[PDB]
């Protein structure tokens, strides 16, 4: 069955720090001016065990950082240098450095910085560095064939055309063997892979030019290495330490900084009133807010709602974010509201489109809950900005596309896992525990967010009202579930009379037929457990909205 | 290698109830005078989806509360009721009205008990509080007695359980027909075991003559079966719990005196530390008393103070030969000196003095290290006499292998580190607490027979992280491989043996998942962190069996 132990991976009980280890006020107090000297003193020595290769250990740590940062696979984001644990007899050699710092320098930061310092101290000038990789708590030779193989194995790493050549040349070496590769004939016997640069015509547009402009090789290799070790770290607000560069690069998905005073509380109330007074259905605002804030990968920290890219080309064309029913009308209405509030702004208070998307989501939930008999307030922390189309990298936002969304009953053709391990994977990416997954599924089914507004999972008698009616009616035993005669995957449920009453997908009934999920649904769908469900859903929704805010603080 | 995910089982993140919800304050506020009516209304019906019985679902919920309570393995404690999916769809109309105030284990077991009580019977009592996550004349007799001794049942409760279970599914129709006409199978025949085995028959004939005694014996046997792994009598919630206590609960006398606090604690700590007792004696005694606890059936703990009693003093791990008699005599003398000469109606019990000696020894050791701390101590324990503890029942709590005391006895089903992992799982200790407790106990001096296996400290009797600093040191090479077999040794670059280790010590310096939790306490600036976390872990271990304070 489902492995629901993946949702609570790396809990706070196995963390030897507990609750007072914000890894941003410690490493910001690091002494980089002296840590580099300690690294140099450790690396430029021999040891009885593991004897030195001509002294310097620079090659060792450079190849180690490379083989630890080359695991990042774009198709799901996991890998990189900041995750897992990728020889580990080095942790018995870098220990004389970690001993002097301890909790102010995680193992990932120390290993990657050892590699970077080795590069810096072997006749080079690297780009920059940024600490903040938290430590996981489990720490035939054919030219064309080789060329296509390296192109594919770096395309999975998101290295395109010039970073591939720069990385290969630098790793094998700012020219020291480029002049070797053009000096004479080359033969073979029982390495010629580097000849792929000399053979492949796409490489020749840059590689042969690099013989005349060696400084270009150095610059592009510095940029390629900086990309290589920082690809699995996130947007540039987790980049801690006094080493980060002063410029931002287009592969980071940059967002403009705030140039306007953030909205207070009276302005929040006025905007919340102005949104739900424009004639927007709750199923529109909630769907748009979830769409903007459920394209987030908690492994590569890339995506999220910040930047407000749901109106941009990469994220509006997706079939999940159906741009035919309502994702142009909603965006036009919110843009008009933003312009109206910006023009007659009370002072220097301005609202950015990402703020309005998340605010529309929160106001829609508040209105639905107020219509459900309760009186709740959804927390909203402003500060998001809007990223222009020139800063979105249309070709990069093509893997964040959800091939299958579990909270919206979207199931695209061609899926690896049938219909509910993809929901588990999505809930793992958003870093959602099992109770939060269950409460979010229930709230989104009841509110109305299903793709194409299908009635697959809407168990509520009267929609647009945040109640636990997806949980009460799921456990009801007056209805029996059998696969539909039209075998599309639906599980139409019939009552005791013999007429069809509800209709479900594999997600709803895997909540209703598992063991742990059944226990959670029984907790959330009892009698006199509506207020608990409302509070838990508001907390889960706020966490989802603010997922990509703390690391872009 | 090791599976460190077993230590953090059932975290607080997967609990939908939050960290502010306690079962005791909720379930005591339900009225069992109406839950019984709801259960009876649900269990007397015919749901179309589930083919009902004649007219009553009872005979299916006794057999459901039995097979969910006859899986209690005494050898480790796991199983029982506190640890079909078609009944979960039938008892829902009852759990719906209650929800948070009635866990599934309590509801299913209480449905079984109510069905038994409503089938012409008068049961003993109930306590809520179970949270949720072939010719064989003698062969059958020996098989049933073995499979019921695996659940710790006597020779009278076995017959009572068999007769009752075969009756409810007094009437005594299972005994009158047992001897009616040449009753013998010539193809049930397992029931002949009572009719052939002399030990069973001796009481079975009396029951056939004294039917009224069978009702009492079966009531007590059923009460034992239901509440076998629920814990001491202080965990029984609800208004149904009986007013008497039984010898299988490991009862302790109630407090009949005031409780020492905040000045008598200081006086007793000074008197303990001024009696000429080594830190390696007080810490070892306190750990021995408070590390015989099974966090699966909640049986054991320091409460009751049985370290001086026969079941727990004879164990080889406690080592009664060298130092467990001098310590106990000294603490008993201190108790007798502080009881009679006490200022008023204030008194101290021997279990309190054992735990207080442990805390005072740790305080003295830490003060010798260079810090100045106070180990919190919550009194309340009492002393259980010898007549209130069973020699035969406690023979299974004996640790055949202790990892924190570096004790490894013959007959090891698993290597020396999986036993440590299982022991730390029983005490409900997370991985950081396991590592810190191992380091602190090695440094303080608690090893069985005072062996220098794992003592990496240059000068003992000082609570420091020197077990962590010297373990990660790479100036020492371990002559045998750290993961093959035997006891290792540490040799420096000069070829001279410096440290001596064991398979339990050299896992916190060779396991990539556990060597990460020794680089947090083994650092340069992480001495006070280690001291504070060791005090927290020691307090958690001491207060494991304090169910009357929570």
Numbering used by the authors:
A (entry chain A): 42 to 127, 141 to 193, 238 to 271, 329 to 345, 378 to 740
B (entry chain B): 42 to 124, 141 to 190, 238 to 273, 328 to 345, 378 to 740
What does the published report state?
In Mycobacterium tuberculosis the multifunctional heme enzyme KatG is indispensable for activation of isoniazid (INH), a first-line pro-drug for treatment of tuberculosis. The homodimeric structure is predominantly α-helical with each protomer (∼80 kDa) composed of two domains. The N-terminal domain contains a heme b and substrate binding site, which are essential for enzymatic function. A covalently linked “MYW catalytic triad” is formed by the conserved residues, Met255, Tyr229, and Trp107, which is essential for catalase activity (Jakopitsch et al., 2003, 2004; Santoni et al., 2004).
A cryo-EM map to 3.4 Å resolution was obtained for the T275P variant. The structure again displays significant areas of disorder compared with the WT KatG. The loop containing the Thr275 residue (residues 274–329) displays no density and therefore could not be modeled. Likewise, fragmented density within the heme pocket was not sufficient to satisfactorily model a heme in either protomers. In addition, other heme pocket residues, such as Trp107 and His270, are significantly perturbed compared with the WT KatG structure. Furthermore, no density was observed for the loop containing Tyr229, a residue that is part of the MYW catalytic triad, thus suggesting that the crosslink is not present in this KatG variant. The cryo-EM structure of the T275P variant reveals a considerably disordered structure compared with the WT protein. Several loop regions surrounding the heme pocket that are well defined in the WT protein cannot be modeled owing to the absence of density. The MYW catalytic triad is no longer formed and we observe no density for the Tyr229 residue (a residue part of the MYW triad). As expected from our heme binding assays, the structure of the T275P variant before heme loading displayed little density for a well-defined bound heme.
